[PDB]
mmCIF file of C-alpha atoms (C1' of nucleotides) in Angstrom:
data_model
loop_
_atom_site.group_PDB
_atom_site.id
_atom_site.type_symbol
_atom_site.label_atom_id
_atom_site.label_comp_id
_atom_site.label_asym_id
_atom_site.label_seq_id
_atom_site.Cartn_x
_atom_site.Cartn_y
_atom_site.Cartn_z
ATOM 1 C CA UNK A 1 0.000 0.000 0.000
ATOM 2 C CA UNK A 2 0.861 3.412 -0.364
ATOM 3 C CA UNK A 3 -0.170 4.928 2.675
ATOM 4 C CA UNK A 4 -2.947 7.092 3.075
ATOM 5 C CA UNK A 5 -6.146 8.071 4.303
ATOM 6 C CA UNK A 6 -9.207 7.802 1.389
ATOM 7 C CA UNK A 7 -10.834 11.382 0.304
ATOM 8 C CA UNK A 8 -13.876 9.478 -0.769
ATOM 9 C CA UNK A 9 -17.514 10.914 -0.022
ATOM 10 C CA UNK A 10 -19.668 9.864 -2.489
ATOM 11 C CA UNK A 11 -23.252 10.601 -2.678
ATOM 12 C CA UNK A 12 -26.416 11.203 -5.339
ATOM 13 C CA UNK A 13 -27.254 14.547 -6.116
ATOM 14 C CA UNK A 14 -29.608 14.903 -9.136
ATOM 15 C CA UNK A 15 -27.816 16.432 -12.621
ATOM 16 C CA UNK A 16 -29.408 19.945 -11.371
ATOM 17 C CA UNK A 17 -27.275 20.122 -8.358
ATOM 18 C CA UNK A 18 -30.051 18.842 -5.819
ATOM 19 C CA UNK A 19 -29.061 16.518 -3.326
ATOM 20 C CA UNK A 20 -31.786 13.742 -4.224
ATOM 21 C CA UNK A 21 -33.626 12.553 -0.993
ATOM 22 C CA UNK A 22 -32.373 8.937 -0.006
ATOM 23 C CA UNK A 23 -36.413 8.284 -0.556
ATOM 24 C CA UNK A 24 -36.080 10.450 -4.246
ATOM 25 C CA UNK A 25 -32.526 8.418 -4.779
ATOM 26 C CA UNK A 26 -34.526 5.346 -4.230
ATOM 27 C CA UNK A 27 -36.935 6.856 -6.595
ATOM 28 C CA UNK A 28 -34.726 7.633 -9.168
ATOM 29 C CA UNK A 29 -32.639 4.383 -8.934
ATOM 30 C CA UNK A 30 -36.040 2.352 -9.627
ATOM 31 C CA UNK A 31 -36.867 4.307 -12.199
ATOM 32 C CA UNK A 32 -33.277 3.811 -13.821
ATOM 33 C CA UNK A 33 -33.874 -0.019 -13.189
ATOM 34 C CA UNK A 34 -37.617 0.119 -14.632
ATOM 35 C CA UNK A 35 -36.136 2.366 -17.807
ATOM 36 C CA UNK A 36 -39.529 4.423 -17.099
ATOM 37 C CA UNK A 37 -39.729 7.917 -15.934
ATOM 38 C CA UNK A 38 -42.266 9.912 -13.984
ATOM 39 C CA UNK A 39 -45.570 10.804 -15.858
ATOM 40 C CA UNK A 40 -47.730 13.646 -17.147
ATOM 41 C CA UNK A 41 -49.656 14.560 -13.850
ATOM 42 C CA UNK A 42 -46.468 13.353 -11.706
ATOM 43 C CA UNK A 43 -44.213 16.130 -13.753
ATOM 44 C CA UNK A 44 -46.940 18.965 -13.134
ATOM 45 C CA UNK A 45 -46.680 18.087 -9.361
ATOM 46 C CA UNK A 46 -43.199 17.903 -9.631
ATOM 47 C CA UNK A 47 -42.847 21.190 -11.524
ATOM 48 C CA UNK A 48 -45.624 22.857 -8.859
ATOM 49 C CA UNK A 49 -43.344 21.516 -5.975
ATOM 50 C CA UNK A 50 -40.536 23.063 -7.272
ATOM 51 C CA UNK A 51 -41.690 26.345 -8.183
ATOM 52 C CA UNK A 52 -42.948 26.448 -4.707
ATOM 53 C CA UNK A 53 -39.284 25.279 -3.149
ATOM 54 C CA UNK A 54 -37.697 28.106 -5.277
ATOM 55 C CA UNK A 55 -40.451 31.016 -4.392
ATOM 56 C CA UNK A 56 -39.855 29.717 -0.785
ATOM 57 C CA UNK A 57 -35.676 30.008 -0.933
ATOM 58 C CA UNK A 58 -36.068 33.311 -2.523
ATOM 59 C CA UNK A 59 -37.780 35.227 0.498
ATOM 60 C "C1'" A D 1 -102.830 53.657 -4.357
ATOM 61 C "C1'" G D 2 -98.665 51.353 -0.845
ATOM 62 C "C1'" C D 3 -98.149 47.370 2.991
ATOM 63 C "C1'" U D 4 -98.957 42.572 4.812
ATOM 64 C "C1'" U D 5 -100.789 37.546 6.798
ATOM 65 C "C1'" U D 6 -100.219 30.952 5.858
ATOM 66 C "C1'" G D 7 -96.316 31.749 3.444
ATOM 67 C "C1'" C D 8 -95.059 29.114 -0.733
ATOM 68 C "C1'" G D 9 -90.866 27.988 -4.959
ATOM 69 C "C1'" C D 10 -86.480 30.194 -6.734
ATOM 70 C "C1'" A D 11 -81.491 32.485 -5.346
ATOM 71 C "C1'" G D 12 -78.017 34.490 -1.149
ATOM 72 C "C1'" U D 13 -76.779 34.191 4.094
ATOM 73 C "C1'" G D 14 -76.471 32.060 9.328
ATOM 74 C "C1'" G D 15 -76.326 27.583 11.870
ATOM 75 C "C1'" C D 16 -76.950 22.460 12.876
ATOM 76 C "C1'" A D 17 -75.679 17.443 11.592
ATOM 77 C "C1'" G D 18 -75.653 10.525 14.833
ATOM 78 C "C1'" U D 19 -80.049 12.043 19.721
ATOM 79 C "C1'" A D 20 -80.297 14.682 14.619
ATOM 80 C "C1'" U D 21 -82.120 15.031 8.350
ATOM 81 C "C1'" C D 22 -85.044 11.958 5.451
ATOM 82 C "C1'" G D 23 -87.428 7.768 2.819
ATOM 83 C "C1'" U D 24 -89.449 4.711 6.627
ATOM 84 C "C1'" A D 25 -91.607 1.020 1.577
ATOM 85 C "C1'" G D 26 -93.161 -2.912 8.016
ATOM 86 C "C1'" C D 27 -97.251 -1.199 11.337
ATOM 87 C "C1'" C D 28 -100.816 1.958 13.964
ATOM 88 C "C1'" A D 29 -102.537 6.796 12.453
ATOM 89 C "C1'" A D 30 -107.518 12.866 11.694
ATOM 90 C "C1'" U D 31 -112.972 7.085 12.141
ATOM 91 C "C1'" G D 32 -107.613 9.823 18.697
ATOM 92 C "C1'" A D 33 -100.991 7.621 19.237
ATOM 93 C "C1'" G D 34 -100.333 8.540 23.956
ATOM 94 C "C1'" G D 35 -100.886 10.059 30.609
ATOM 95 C "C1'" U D 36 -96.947 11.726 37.310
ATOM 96 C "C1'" C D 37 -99.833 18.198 36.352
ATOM 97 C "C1'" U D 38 -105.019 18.996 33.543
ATOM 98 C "C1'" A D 39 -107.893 12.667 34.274
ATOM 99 C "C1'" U D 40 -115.500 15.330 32.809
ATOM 100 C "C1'" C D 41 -107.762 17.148 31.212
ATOM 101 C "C1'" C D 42 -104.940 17.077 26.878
ATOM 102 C "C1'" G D 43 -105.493 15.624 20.953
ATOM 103 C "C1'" A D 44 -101.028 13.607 15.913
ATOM 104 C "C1'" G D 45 -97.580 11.016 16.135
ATOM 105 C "C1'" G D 46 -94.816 6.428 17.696
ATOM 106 C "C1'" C D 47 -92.576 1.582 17.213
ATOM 107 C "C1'" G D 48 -88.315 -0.919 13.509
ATOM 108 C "C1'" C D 49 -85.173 -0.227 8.454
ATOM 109 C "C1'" G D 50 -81.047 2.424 6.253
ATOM 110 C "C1'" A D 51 -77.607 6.193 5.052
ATOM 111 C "C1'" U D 52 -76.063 11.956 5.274
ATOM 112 C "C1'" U D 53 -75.532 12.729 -0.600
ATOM 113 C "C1'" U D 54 -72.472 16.396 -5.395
ATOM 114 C "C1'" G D 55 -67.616 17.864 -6.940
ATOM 115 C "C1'" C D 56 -62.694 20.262 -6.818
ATOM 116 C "C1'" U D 57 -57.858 20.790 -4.819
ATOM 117 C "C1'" A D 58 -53.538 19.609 -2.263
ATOM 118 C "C1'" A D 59 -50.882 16.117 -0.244
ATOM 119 C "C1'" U D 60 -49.681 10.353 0.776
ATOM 120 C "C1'" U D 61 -47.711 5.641 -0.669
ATOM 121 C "C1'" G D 62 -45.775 3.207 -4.800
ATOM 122 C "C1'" A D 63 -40.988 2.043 -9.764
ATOM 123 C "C1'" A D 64 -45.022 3.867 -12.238
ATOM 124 C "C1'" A D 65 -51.272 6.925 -8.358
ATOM 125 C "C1'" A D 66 -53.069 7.818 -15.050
ATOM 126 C "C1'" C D 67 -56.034 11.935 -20.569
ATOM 127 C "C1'" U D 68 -53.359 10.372 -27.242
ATOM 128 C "C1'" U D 69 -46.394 8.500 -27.942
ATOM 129 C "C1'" C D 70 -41.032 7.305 -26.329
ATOM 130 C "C1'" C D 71 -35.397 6.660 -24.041
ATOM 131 C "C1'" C D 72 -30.918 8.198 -27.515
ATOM 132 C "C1'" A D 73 -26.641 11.272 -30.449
ATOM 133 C "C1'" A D 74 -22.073 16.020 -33.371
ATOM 134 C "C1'" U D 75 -25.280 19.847 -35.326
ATOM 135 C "C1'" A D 76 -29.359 23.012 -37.047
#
RNA sequence: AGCUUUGCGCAGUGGCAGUAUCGUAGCCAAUGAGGUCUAUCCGAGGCGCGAUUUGCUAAUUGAAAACUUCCCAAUA
């Protein structure tokens, strides 16, 4: 060995920079398994959800 | 001529909602169901059935919780 202590923290934030919720990392790692992705009325809550998060952060 | 009585039906408001609201279809019942007052007085409900139906929204779980295609790659 070389001799060292490991730098590794690993973890699963979403490709927009949001740290995924071990229950949304689940989420996302089933749908990755299942090859299917969230549908119409799912997105418009999603999208509603986040609008409200980012309204929220702003004030 | 203006108002108003039983008020009715429409629409708005307030409140109530398991004891209640109602059908009650089973039964008695304006040809009296019921009693400590009132008994030569009073006069229309009670026994049993079943619910409190119409829609919208958020969330919640799930891999997906639903409304007409989809994951992909250099560009335009």
């Amino acid at each position: 060995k070389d001799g060292y202590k490991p730098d590794v923290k690993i973890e699963y934030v979403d490709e927009t920079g949001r740290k995924l919720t071990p229950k949304e990392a689940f989420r996302q790692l089933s749908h990755r398994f299942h090859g299917k992705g969230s549908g119409k009325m799912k997105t418009e809550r999603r999208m509603k959800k986040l609008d409200e998060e980012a309204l929220l952060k702003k004030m």
